[PDB]
A paper describes a structure:
Acinetobacter sp. Ver3 is a polyextremophilic strain characterized by a high tolerance to radiation and pro-oxidants. The Ver3 genome comprises the sodB and sodC genes encoding an iron (AV3SodB) and a copper/zinc superoxide dismutase (AV3SodC), respectively; however, the specific role(s) of these genes has remained elusive. SODs are widely distributed diverse metalloenzymes that are classified according to the metal cofactor present in the active site. Manganese SODs (MnSODs or SodA enzymes) and iron SODs (FeSODs or SodB enzymes) are found in the bacterial cytosol and have very similar active sites, suggesting that these enzymes are closely related and evolved from a common ancestor, a relation that is supported by the identification of SOD variants termed cambialistic that use either iron or manganese (cambialistic Fe/MnSODs) depending on metal availability.
In order to explore the structural properties of AV3SodB, we solved the crystal structure of the enzyme to 1.34 Å resolution. AV3SodB crystallized in space group C2221, with one protein molecule per asymmetric unit. The final atomic model comprises AV3SodB residues 1–208. The Root-mean-square deviation (RMSD) between the AV3SodB monomer and the chain A in the E. coli FeSOD structure is 0.9 Å for 191 aligned residues. The active site of AV3SodB, located close to the dimer interface, is composed of conserved residues among FeSODs. mFo-DFc electron density maps clearly revealed the presence of a metal ion bound at the active site, which, based on our bioinformatic analysis, was modelled as an iron ion. The metal ion is coordinated in a distorted trigonal bipyramidal geometry with the side chain of His28 and a solvent molecule as axial ligands and the side chains of His80, Asp164 and His168 as equatorial ligands. The OH-/H2O ligand hydrogen bonds Asp164 and the active site Gln76. This OH-/H2O, believed to be OH- in oxidized FeSODs and H2O in the reduced enzymes, is connected to bulk water via a conserved hydrogen bonding network that begins with Gln76 and continues with residues Tyr36 and His32. Additional conserved hydrogen bonds link the active site to the interface between AV3SodB monomers, including a hydrogen bond between His32 of one monomer and Tyr171 of the other, and a hydrogen bond between His168 of one monomer and Glu167 of the other. Interestingly, AV3SodB crystallized in the presence of flavin mononucleotide (FMN), added as an additive in homemade crystallization conditions.
Author numbering:
A (entry chain A), B (entry chain A): 1 to 208
């Protein structure tokens, strides 16, 4: 049977510097993301979910209180892998690819999209995520926020871009200054090539 | 009219060392707790809640979606003040005062209480709090966990002890090792004198 794996970061541990440090990537990927993988494999071992894909596990556990631990760990594995691929060395700034025109259509301009995405990331209370999503591949774009592990697949939406706003994502480099982390993400980290692939339902990134 | 204030810590910024550092107390109290105070005062200014006590504001906003920002900030002001007073230099260990016998009655022993309190603190997913509570002053003890800003007053319960398990409470000193923070809290930080006062409905601590 297949097993859930911790994918490698799609870049080196100094490649997001000085925006996100080596130390953050070490704790965030090598400890937090790893723990979600380990916990999920332990929870599904010897059950009817062993050997299913990560997305099958999320779909099988969403909305089921008796499977909250499975959902929380599986959705967090998926969200972190999505997040790492949403960043890149020399990323950030205005959109490239097909998403540029689609962002202008949905939001009016890149700057309006960035304002709305930053507001979602800023106002998510507690732990969670902010997302650019589509209703379907190549479809209508919108912004949503989620709490804790919740994720666009659990709402039938297609994730396109995400930022993790759990405190561990930014506390080492920014302490309480979540807005500065969010601005840094938009200005200097966003990977539009991955976002475009996800919007177009294409394969991309390091996801296993 | 009265205003909501940031109470001083009830000890010096090195007084919890090495268990909780000066740096954590600076960010956690001087930045996070302060921000909840500032936000709450801004939200109630010029409204019918200005000049009410902190507990009146929580009671007026609980369960009202249109007042979620007021509730989240007011409950977090209260929770942090409660939390600081739940710690002390040379604290920790088995209970003193009336609570010792009440803990034996409710949980069987101090060690069983500590196990259950640590489990609540460990399994709270995302941001939140773990609590020893009573159903009324001098009443029946139990443990509960809350998510984000939620707090025993919003459930008609009397808070007796709390630990903050938002990541900012421990990330500077423990990084991802929340269990080590929880053990450190029980072994070395708990202030039973404050907990006893709260259980007995008496006045105590630095709360303004
Ligand atoms: C955005 C995204 C993130 C994923 N993250 C992981 C992951 O962290 N661990 C894992 O085992 N599978 C993860 N997967 C699933 C695998 O990439 C892969 O789709 C699955 O193992 C099925 O294999 P196949 O695509 O070669 O048929 C992820 C998939 C997607 C779309
Ligand atoms: C546990 C606890 C925490 C509190 N924290 C604060 C606080 O951080 N800021 C504040 O303005 N009032 C806080 N209060 C309310 C004040 O301590 C006080 O009760 C209120 O201002 C009413 O004043 P009085 O007790 O002198 O009549 C807190 C009260 C309690 C019980
Ligand atoms: Fe994270
Ligand atoms: Fe806190």
């Amino acid at each position: 049977m297949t097993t859930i794996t911790l994918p490698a970061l799609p870049y080196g541990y100094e490649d997001l510097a000085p925006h996100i440090s080596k130390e953050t990537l070490e704790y965030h990927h090598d400890k937090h993301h790893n723990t979600y993988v380990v916990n999920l494999n332990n929870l599904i071992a010897g059950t009817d979910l062993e050997g299913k894909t990560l997305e099958e596990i999320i779909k099988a556990s969403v909305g089921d209180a008796s499977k909250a631990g499975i959902f929380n760990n599986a959705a967090q594995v998926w969200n972190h892998t999505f997040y790492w691929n949403c960043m890149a060395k020399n990323g950030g700034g205005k959109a490239t690819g097909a998403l540029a025109a689609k962002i202008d259509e949905a939001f009016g301009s890149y700057e309006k999209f960035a304002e709305e995405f930053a507001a979602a990331a800023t106002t998510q209370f507690g732990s969670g995520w902010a997302w650019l999503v589509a209703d379907e591949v190549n479809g209508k774009l919108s912004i949503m926020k989620t709490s804790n592990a919740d994720t666009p697949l659990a709402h039938g939406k297609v994730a396109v871009l995400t930022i993790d706003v759990w405190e561990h994502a930014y506390y080492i480099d920014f302490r309480n200054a979540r807005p500065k982390y969010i601005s840094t993400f938009l200005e200097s980290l966003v990977n539009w090539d991955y976002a475009n692939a996800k919007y177009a339902g294409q394969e991309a990134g390091v996801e296993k």
